[PDB]
Design a protein around this nucleic acid. Structure first.
Ligand code: SF4
Ligand SMILES: [Mn+2]
Ligand SMILES: [Mn+2]
Ligand SMILES: [Mn+2]
Ligand SMILES: [Mn+2]
Ligand SMILES: [Mn+2]
Ligand SMILES: [Mn+2]
Lengths: 95, 553, 340, 95, 362, 340
DNA sequence: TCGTAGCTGAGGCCTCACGATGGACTTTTTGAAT
DNA sequence: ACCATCGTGAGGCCTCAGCTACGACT
């Protein structure tokens, strides 16, 4: 049952930065200067987990993934003071 | 000079809870919780800043007055209007709130309506036609007008009357009868309504505790050559010019400075400005000095404290109960915690009637010198037998000499530990009683000599076994402290840095160990127990309750 | 007595102990000493530094270290855990219950006020031009009013004649201006102490009273006394009752004074005031200029509490409180007010 | 009842950066290149909320505060791949 | 589908709560007639007038429909192939012109029995019977439940009721399927003829309906344009579903395979026409989603504006993601999942694993 | 028939429609046309571009657009929603159930293989030096083996004689080497098609077979046919049965060929192979060099399916499948195999 | 018109070390909760 | 051994625009 995740990265290589960067584009949506919001299910969260142990270099980079929760009731858990936050929504894109 | 003008929100709270009003005005004792802080925040950013002035002469203009000073000679009250909205000569009060529109008829509860009516009458007294105001809820951003009734004015004036009469009375009004109103009164932490009721002998069942709010953790500086420096709102402790650690100031609640540590004057100032108590302790933990701040707001508490202090019979009875509780806790600890391997596993019952006859003699103490004698005898037997459980018997170098109480530089490991625990608990008690307005030095049983505040010295005796003894046992049995942990000297047995580290850590955990109150039967930390016992004592001094609960387990 | 207070202006100061001596240092270069024989409270201004060893020795000698801003703003005392203070405090409490001690003490402070008032009349009577000398009948009435006080049968009587004589005094308080009425800043004899200020004269008077009471509070706490338990005023409801009792005789020499320079020297002008539905409130600039003026008042030295040693009023406060302690505990009789 | 919070900031002013920065030091602990972990109670979370609407400049900076939860069972909600995460603990500091 | 295969496989038990959705995405609709679809890495960006209109996360994508004259980067097509995401091409009106395949589907016996079915006239007859019966039974349900009269119409005229009920009776009493065409046509004629009886509680401004203008390619009516659009655009959904389960969506039993209209899915959809297409049309019209200004006139007829198409597709999507309860298995399930489950059940019935196909009558 | 396939190598190509015409553009500069009369599948190599309008018109004319990498790697077809393909597919399915259609069709493909095999014997018999001419009795035995096929009574018989004649052929397959035995790369007549390769000859043969089958799969799907439902092999279990049936006659001309250049021209050497518990597997470099060699085989043109028009084998595949369609649906009788 | 994956540049976050102007404190009331 | 917030630099994240190569593939 669907969950929302928040991911923050600090990377010390432009190569790895590129790769990680748009692989992340593969998973969520950019939200903050080095943070992506991520509304995902178990299978793809595991796929994520797999990809980023292995684009990333362990001893010396650092990334964090945070399960906020079920993503039905997220904004009770969130507060934004810059631009307003509202989470990802699953609809088909019709444009 | 019996009574000045009454502040208007004091009326607001009064109809809310007359007891609360008595507390909040006659003695004050303000406190903060979620909603109090929230309301302060919403009020300050706009209304704390001033606005337009109320013109003496008013012909035709819009007035947007903010933070107006009005007070009534004849009505007997004073106010700061939250905002004034007036067209030429027809003005209207404006109040700000913090929450939603309440789901009540008129969208406003009784009290705030009394606010509006009363300070509207204040506006009238200064030559104005108000006849109604409004409530501006900040959150939903909404104005809800209020019309000024007749009997609403009656409510206001009668409340004025009955404020004045309860103040001149000098009588603690009773708490609410098990009302949902208290559990957010933000002073239930000091009203103690369920407790005051239950002991106030109108027997009900006390409800689950309103939990901890706005409490931090203490600051212990044992490193004998540490530097304490302020940086902004953080506080950094450094030793050998290296940042050993820092503590978040808000999370801090107390500061104890062992031995020859150093404090930056600025840090002291900062602590003062957040009136965080700070204390000074000898390297061994002798309690040498602390700070005060212009006394404590309450006075009647101290007044009755002294009245107590000058009734010999009250003192006698209280000492009776104190020592009885002490030796009853010795009952409990001794039998429950006795460690024999076989045929000692049960506490020798001769001891049992021994101490039981001791409690009997204790209540049969005619004066308190006899009470000293009984105290000494019981304590002598208790320490004499004390060795009967630690590690299931004395360890290597952990032998105990019970005679070496009343003996300042300890000659024993265990005596050093015990004296340390005693004195270092004493600080806790001192802070607690200071916080509640009691003068920790004016005692009834113990007598005020240096380094040992008399009243708290009294106050701690029941807790000596549950706290100090328990900690010593925990550390010794759990292998926390061993022979190599101590340093020998002509002075005696002293503690290494690692020893002090770990001993304080264990003691702290014991403070943050939950127990169940025998009479109120709910989980509560020993530390909270300290304040609750303090305030209960206060009430008993005020006569609000028949007798002091001694907390016997 | 025991000793005298020690002040250290310097934000630079580094203080340690020389055995029996306290030593002040500027930049490792040496400034002053206390040496502990005749010492009283050690007060440290903003970011002044004193060594922990010195602090411990001070505690052992039971001396109330206290803390001021660099501006001189008080923000805390430091007290040792000794029988100095409670002894005083307990003495205070039973002797508080005793009525005619309260009577005697009160009517001393009242006559002290009022004698100071008339003395101030002849220190600053500014009815000059034709009346450099105040109306004599006023002064027969007054000296009668200290007599009226000295008979005082009971406390409520004392307060009644108090109010009478005080209104009397404020009737001619207008004459104290720098030559006439203070048009733009007029004084009311009947709107006295009405809670917000209805006249600028009342505003300045009230603010001066505020801080004067406040310094009495801090000095009172400096010694082992409780300021909120008074013998004359009513204790509860936030009022520092003992401080209020203390502050009476010195309203003239300080608060009324501070007003008199602040107005006659042009520091206080018309535009400094704001009128609001019956409230004449100052401006922050006027506030703080007036505050510097009050410090100026605090800075003058008078010499004779009981001995010639030319102290500023501020140290006279500590001396006065300590003499009160001397009175209590049955050490000296009848508490000889300072009067000039 | 105690909760844990995670805060991320993107600020476009060194002045504001300084102020926000060590005011944040007033509340939690640095964890990530622009992120602080925060174990707090209601009163001080509101104090936080108040301070940062007003050091921060709304239209144009951006900050986020994330309630992970009660902070008894946090690490079930967390995953770190760089340095290991373990949350704040309330004990008195005794050093 | 073990619980289902058991429960219909006639060893009666109670089916348990559904094993929920896993590994399913959402479709890609490209209606902007001049949009440009480009691959960047694993993301897919849609841009119009050389501006990044939007992008879709590839993994979350499940289908792609390309309306009208949109443009696809060959690379994007390749990427979709490599994640064998089906892609379809639709006329600007939504005519279903082409899609892709990939080396056939792994199963064969499914298709084999499908054809065996396809060549047993009696199986075809029975299945068509049940299909049309279910269709007109859903007309039962929609008509009476959703009828909006203001007073004395609020109840559906019961003459209609035995009318259609006798229709279902004749339907199972159809001897051959040409008679079934006749019954189908008659019932549908009455149904559309009465269709106006609920929308907005009566026809709106320019929303009048002409039931004769079915079988009429460029729609002359607003509502006919809406209905044909919904029909054809549902048809795509069915086609994808049956392709996914290995069925050849073109080899039908009842309908016959002409261009743009896959025969088997054309059959397959008939029971769902009212529950899906009709329901959506009603929802949009009554809910004020679509109004007169939303349509464009032409000699061709009534066509849709961009905003019209936007919102109509959005509503239809929501209808897909609207949960219902299966009459026989009595658990919540999306219409879209219903599509696959009905498909696989059909498969099993073709394999003979179960006695008869559940027609999903509500 | 209808038309012929169209190829566009260019990754640069931009194709649109000229009414009835398809127009190829290089850089807005114009290249080729199809013009749609004699067109077949439109195949586009990597990142070739064709306008949507052209695609729609193609769909209306029911033509199977398909997609190749720039390398030429197939990755998808595109099919219109029309009765072209199913008609063929349904015809395929009932005519699949019919037995003696399967018999006739099978024994054509078998004789086609084997005649191609002997023809290849005399195209590439490399027993020269003393035996430039192969053993005659082998060829009487063979031509007997196509006769043996033409009598074929039933399918299992057909496969039995198939295996016999194939082992026969592989007995002398060693003679096809470039002058002798291929020491280091020896061929086994009995380890045939054993699943991992036990000989390098078998490895190359198997890989060539793999891709040959695979191109038959793609060409078969190009036309409206199902490759997994065969008339001769067994359909289930992943085997493309119809593709397997198709690929028989062309094993010689293509796979056996591709091996013969790859070995006789030194592209394939000893070191290219890896031995593993009975497995002679190639190296990736050898793989892809061999792959280029296979493309080379695919690139030669033969002219006479039924008409002189000199097509590469690859277009012959489409021609062959379409002729199969011509056979099905009862349009032409008896499916005249290509044989050289 | 290959189109995209990968790499250079340039700006801007983000933090720290090391430096330098000088040394906050204002009468009282308000401030939630159901 | 007057302290502690305040202000500059210089490095290191962080992202983008703009370029250049190559062709996933069994
Ligand atoms: S519990 Fe709170 S609200 Fe109730 S009477 Fe006590 S202080 Fe007032
Ligand atoms: Mn980062
Ligand atoms: Mn308010
Ligand atoms: Mn004792
Ligand atoms: Mn007075
Ligand atoms: Mn940031
Ligand atoms: Mn074969």
């Amino acid at each position: 049952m669907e969950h929302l995740y928040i991911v923050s990265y600090d990377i010390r290589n432009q190569r790895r930065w590129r790769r990680l960067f748009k692989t992340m584009h593969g998973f969520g949506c950019w939200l903050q200067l080095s943070v992506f919001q991520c509304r995902l299910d178990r299978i793809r969260i595991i796929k994520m987990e797999a990809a980023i142990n292995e684009i990333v270099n362990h001893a010396e980079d650092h990334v964090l993934i945070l399960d906020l929760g079920p993503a039905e009731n997220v904004k009770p858990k969130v507060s934004s003071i810059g631009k307003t936050f509202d989470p990802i929504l699953r609809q088909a894109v019709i444009v | 000079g019996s009574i000045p003008l009454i502040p208007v929100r004091m009326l607001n709270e009064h109809v809310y809870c007359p007891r609360l009003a008595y507390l909040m005005w006659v003695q004050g004792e303000f406190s903060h919780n979620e909603f109090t802080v929230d309301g302060v925040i919403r009020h300050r950013r706009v209304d704390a800043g001033g606005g337009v002035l109320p013109s003496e002469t008013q012909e035709d203009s819009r007035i947007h007055a903010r933070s107006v000073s009005l007070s009534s000679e004849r009505l007997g009250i004073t106010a700061k209007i939250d905002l004034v909205e007036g067209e030429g000569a027809y003005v209207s009060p404006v109040d700000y709130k913090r929450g939603k529109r309440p789901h009540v008829a008129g969208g406003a509860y009784e009290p705030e309506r009394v606010q509006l009516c009363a300070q509207g009458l204040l506006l009238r007294e200064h030559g104005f036609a108000s006849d109604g105001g409004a409530l501006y809820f900040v959150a939903s951003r909404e104005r809800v007008p209020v019309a000024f009734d007749d009997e609403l004015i009656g409510r206001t004036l009668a409340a004025i009357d009955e404020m004045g009469r309860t103040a001149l009375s000098g009588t603690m009004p009773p708490p609410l009868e098990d009302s949902p109103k208290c559990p957010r009164c933000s002073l239930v932490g000091i009203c103690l309504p369920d407790e005051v009721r239950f002991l106030s002998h109108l027997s009900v069942e006390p409800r689950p505790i309103i939990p901890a709010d706005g409490r931090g953790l203490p600051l212990y500086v044992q490193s004998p050559k540490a530097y304490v420096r302020k940086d902004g709102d953080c506080l950094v402790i450094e030793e050998e010019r290296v940042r050993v650690a820092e503590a978040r100031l808000g999370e801090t609640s107390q500061v104890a400075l062992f031995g020859n540590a150093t404090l930056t004057t600025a840090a002291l100032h900062e602590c003062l400005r957040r009136e965080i108590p700070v204390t000074w302790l000898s390297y061994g933990g002798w309690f040498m000095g602390h700070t005060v701040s212009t006394g404590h707001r309450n006075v009647e508490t101290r007044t009755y404290q002294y009245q107590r202090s000058f009734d010999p019979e009250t003192c006698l009875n209280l000492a009776r109960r104190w020592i009885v509780a002490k030796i009853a806790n010795c009952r409990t600890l001794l039998r429950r915690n006795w460690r024999g391997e076989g045929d000692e596993a049960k506490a020798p019952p001769g001891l049992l009637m021994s101490l039981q006859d001791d409690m009997r003699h204790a209540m049969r103490a005619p004066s308190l010198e006899v009470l000293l004698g009984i105290e000494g005898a019981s304590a002598g037997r208790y320490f004499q037998h004390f060795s009967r459980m630690l590690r299931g018997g004395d360890g290597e170098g952990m032998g105990f000499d019970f005679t070496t109480r009343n003996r300042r530089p300890p000659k024993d490991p265990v005596n050093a530990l015990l004296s340390f625990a005693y004195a270092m608990l004493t600080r806790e008690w001192t802070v607690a009683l200071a916080a509640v307005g009691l003068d920790p030095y004016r005692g009834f049983y113990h007598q005020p000599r240096f380094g040992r505040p008399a009243l708290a010295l009294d106050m701690m005796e029941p807790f000596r076994p549950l706290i100090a003894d328990s900690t010593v046992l925990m550390a010794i049995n759990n292998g926390e402290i061993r022979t190599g942990d101590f340093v020998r000297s002509a002075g005696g047995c002293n503690l290494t840095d690692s020893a002090r580290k770990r001993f304080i850590a264990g003691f702290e955990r014991r403070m943050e160990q939950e127990v169940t109150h025998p009479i109120f039967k709910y989980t509560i930390s020993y530390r909270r127990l300290l304040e609750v016992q303090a305030r209960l004592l206060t009430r008993y001094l005020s006569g609000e309750i028949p007798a002091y609960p001694n907390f016997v387990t | 007595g025991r000793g005298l207070p020690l002040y250290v202006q310097s934000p630079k100061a580094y203080v340690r102990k020389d055995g029996d001596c306290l030593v002040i240092e500027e930049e490792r270069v040496r400034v002053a000493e206390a040496r502990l024989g005749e010492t009283s409270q050690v007060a440290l201004f903003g970011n002044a530094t004193l060594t922990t060893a010195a602090l411990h020795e001070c505690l052992r000698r039971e001396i109330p270290v206290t803390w001021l801003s660099y501006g001189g703003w008080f923000m805390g005392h430091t007290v040792s855990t000794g029988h100095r203070n409670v002894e005083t405090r307990t003495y205070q409490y039973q002797r508080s219950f005793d009525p005619e001690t309260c009577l005697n003490l009160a009517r001393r402070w009242i006559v002290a006020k009022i004698a100071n008032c008339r003395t101030l009349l002849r220190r600053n009577w500014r009815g000059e031009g034709d009346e450099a000398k105040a109306p004599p009948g006023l002064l027969m009435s007054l000296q009668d009013d200290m007599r009226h006080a000295m008979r005082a049968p009971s406390l409520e009587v004392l307060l009644g004649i108090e109010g009478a004589s005080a209104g009397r005094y404020f009737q001619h308080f207008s004459r104290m201006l720098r030559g006439g009425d203070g048009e733009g800043m007029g004084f009311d004899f009947t709107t006295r102490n009405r809670r917000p200020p209805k006249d600028p004269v009342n505003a300045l008077l009230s603010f001066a009273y505020a801080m004067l009471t406040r310094e009495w509070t801090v000095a009172l706490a400096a010694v082992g006394l409780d300021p909120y338990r008074g013998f004359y005023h009513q204790p509860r409801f936030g009022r520092p009752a003992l401080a209020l009792d203390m502050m009476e005789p010195f309203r003239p020499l300080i608060a009324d004074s501070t007003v008199l320079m602040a107005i006659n020297n042009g520091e206080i002008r018309t535009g400094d005031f704001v009128r609001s539905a019956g409230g004449c409130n100052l401006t922050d600039s006027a506030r703080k200029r007036f505050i510097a003026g009050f410090e100026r008042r605090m800075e003058q030295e008078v010499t004779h509490p009981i001995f010639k040693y030319t102290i500023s009023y501020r140290r006279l406060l500590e001396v006065q409180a300590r003499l009160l302690t001397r009175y209590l505990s049955g050490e000296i009789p009848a508490y000889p007010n300072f009067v000039t």
